[model samples]
Target: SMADEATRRVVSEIPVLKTNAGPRDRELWVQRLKEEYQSLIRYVENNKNADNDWFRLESNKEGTRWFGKCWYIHDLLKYEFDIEFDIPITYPTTAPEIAVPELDGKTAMMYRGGKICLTDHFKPLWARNVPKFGLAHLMALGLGPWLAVEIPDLIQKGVIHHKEKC
Candidate 1:
């Protein structure tokens, strides 16, 4: 219990940047998470026509990890995958590594533990964009783009195929 509190206190003291609103203390993580969550809900509600419109995010009580799923539809074929992320105690100093569990080992861009390898283009942007970056941003910029390129190509190339369960 004491250790947990100590860890929380330490995280709270760290600096974070929230959107274009400028820097804020990591103590505002819960506040930011709530705001970000609502922003995602609103975005989804507004973008009814967009492919992969379905998304779900579930966070643990301790806020250490998040589980999410985003559905992608290509050429009327549906692809669904899990999103898993863990916030490091260092936080803003270290971006949360994002991954898709079901797609793990399906591509070279993905590393062990489902961590997606953000290319030269993304790594720099992610490094500079702290606090402003969160679940919604990751899904939009990271996973969404990755799927747009990977899934369609894989399907057309005969790499990704659907299976029927017994």
Candidate 2:
């Protein structure tokens, strides 16, 4: 229960939790949250240019999700998937939804802006295990396992593939 206690203590220290947590817990949680927040922000900023194909290319406001698009020059494959990224926090808990965009104005394989199909299989493989992967791991997954497949005519003459899909 140390983790829970530690987490509680950290949470309590926040001004918002003064009425809910013990003073000792509050102090610790606040310190921990501040440190964690700073570190996370720094990491995100430093790696903002990590993977241009599947991440945010520029700074933006929090709470507002952004859609990043990248595909083959030609539609080599029948499906066209667009990668969607959200601000504030990245993967482990929130698995970026990479869905096939609508073709010929029919419909895309996504819902509610960029919400994924979040099936049961998705939770365990995408969200349950957090600390198992880091930025490098995410990049490899995105470039290799996630997008190694080819699309039809994606690299054809005069065709263009935009980086931001949404």
Candidate 3:
């Protein structure tokens, strides 16, 4: 509740992830998907209106894999990343593996390309309320914080520098 102004705004405006379903459950999985999409769609709606961005989803069937883009701004320049999440056959038991391969060999937080090496919060946070935590939480709770923390580190270390105009 006590943070800088912008962080609070981002946290409060979008926190409705409580559907609580895991894959292969037969009844709740599909419902969970809707709620999952609903959450992201809800936030993305606000995102584009507040500031526009597009992250697409293309699924072959059921939940093959989800692919999209992620970005952040540093030094007044846009840093964009191709991100993907894969559902294990075990489903929510282990949660979806989130990864950004491009950043490989540049950081300590990533676990190669299989997924990110989630910080301290990722496990305990997910464990306490496993069912309710959806894909949105993964980004909000996982990707959201990691990017903000590490990207600037990368920038200062010269791991990544200003992109020439395309």
Candidate 4:
């Protein structure tokens, strides 16, 4: 499929993938996720002074998976696509899988199922951070960088167009 080919190309162009945590790591990951959840609440509620209004997050009822969005804004263009993630059963030992729905087959830097490809700077930092990594870090470092670079290109290339606000 196109997404499969794109993922392979993405890996070759970028690099990386992960699994479950052991006892200590599991505890740490759970703690981090909880903290991340609160932080997300602060951002969503507009109390944290975080520049996160461009995004949204919601956890499943069980709190194991998180669905998210990275709101894309450029000039008069404002658009957002759906993103979803989950703690690796392994937790912080592995980074969360970040996806952009309806985006598969649209970019070489994406994997099947809309998973954004994390390579270059993001990969090393995420690995080095280990259990210290959390949701904020992933977005700020991983998906943020991807969008910072890709979204503009998509717009400039006419792959995505501005939807004038109503």
Candidate 5:
């Protein structure tokens, strides 16, 4: 974690990425992942609230059947939530969904009783700005603070719902 923080700090200071890169896409992806992961971790560290996040309830290895717990933290929690794309490829414009079961997790899908289903409630946002307002941005901005304290509650909710036989 210390190393990751250090890496981010160092990288943040050095600004300059040529989007024109074609064959070096792997490098781009790797850097992107590292940056995203760092942002998520930082968000977790900063937020200390437990009532305003998509706390995991339960899950299976199959598909979009996860159950999680969430509490109202912000005023918009009732309308604006998280969502994932139907597919996992990070190509299409992944929109931020303002509905239930916000599928904004790492895997981007939930599995219930080992059954898989596609999620289609996501809202489209331009990834071109990902570098600016990425996951870390969301953390520093809002989601992280709301999700930090509620992770355990969400996980407990998942355990209760997921372990149940479908």
Candidate 6:
């Protein structure tokens, strides 16, 4: 499942990217880095402004590691989780699989540390769009889709739940 109409709206709103910088090249990567953060920043801003914010993100100084929390509301029970992903040397050619380490072995289509299993549906999508896709697209289309489908199961199956009272 890719996600609902709202996610599609987010993808369309994401600014298109153009860069050859992969993880190995730091200089050229700055431009690519800028676009990605711009998209993430704008996406986060939009979420907050609309009062339906679902996730938050932060990247390393060099933009190689990303960390964040993605939240969901099911049955009036709000859930939050730790999610992470690393930039690959392949960069533009391959989108890093988003990981939710906390749910590592909880279900199907996922791997250790909650790294998402991209669908055959996802491969062609990326193959068709290289530098054009960028990081923001991965979150919007990748995690956004898988999370939408899986999180509810977590709640229903008694696998996960509301944020701990911390």
On lDDT, the leading prediction is 6
> By descending TM-score, how would the candidates be arranged?
6, 3, 4, 1, 2, 5
- Please provide, for model 1 over 1-166, each residue's C-alpha lDDT reduced to its tens digit, 9 standing for 90 to 100: 6744643442332233364221233546666666656656655654465443667888886567889787777777677777888867666556678888776777787898778877665556666666556555566556767887887877787767865433
- Model 1, position 14, has a per-residue lDDT of 26
Candidate 6 colliding pairs, count: 0
Q: Write the per-residue lDDT of candidate 2 for residues 1-166, one digit (tens) a residue.
A: 6744643342232222111111134464344334434443444454445432333322123323434444332333322355544422333334444443432222232265534343354345434344333223333343333333333323332232444533
Compared with the true structure, model 6 gives a TM-score of 0.88
User: Model 3: which residue pairs collide?
Assistant: none
lDDT at residue 128 of model 6 (Cα atoms): 71
Candidate 5: give its CA RMSD in angstroms: 12.3
> Better model by lDDT, 3 or 5?
3
Better of 4 and 6 by lDDT: 6
Error of 2 at 52 (Å): 11
Pairs of residues at least 3 apart in sequence or in different chains that clash in candidate 4: 20-90, 21-90
The Cα error of candidate 2 at residue 164, in Å, is: 19
List, residue by residue over 90-155, the lDDT tens digit for candidate 6.
Answer: 888877878989888888879877788877767677767777887768877788778788888777
Q: Per-residue lDDT for 50-134 in model 4, tens only?
A: 4446787888755677886668778846778888986666656667779887778888889888889877766665676565555
lDDT of each: 0.64, 0.36, 0.71, 0.65, 0.35, 0.79
Comparing candidate 3 with candidate 6, which one achieves the higher TM-score? Answer: 6
Q: Which candidate is the best by TM-score?
A: 6
TM-score of each prediction: 0.72, 0.33, 0.81, 0.73, 0.33, 0.88
lDDT of 3 at 152: 97
Residue 13, model 6, lDDT: 69
Please estimate how well model 3 matches the true structure, expressed as its whole-model Cα lDDT: 0.71
Report the error of model 1 at residue 84, Å: 1.0
lDDT ranking, high to low: 6, 3, 4, 1, 2, 5
- Which residue pairs in model 1 clash with each other? none
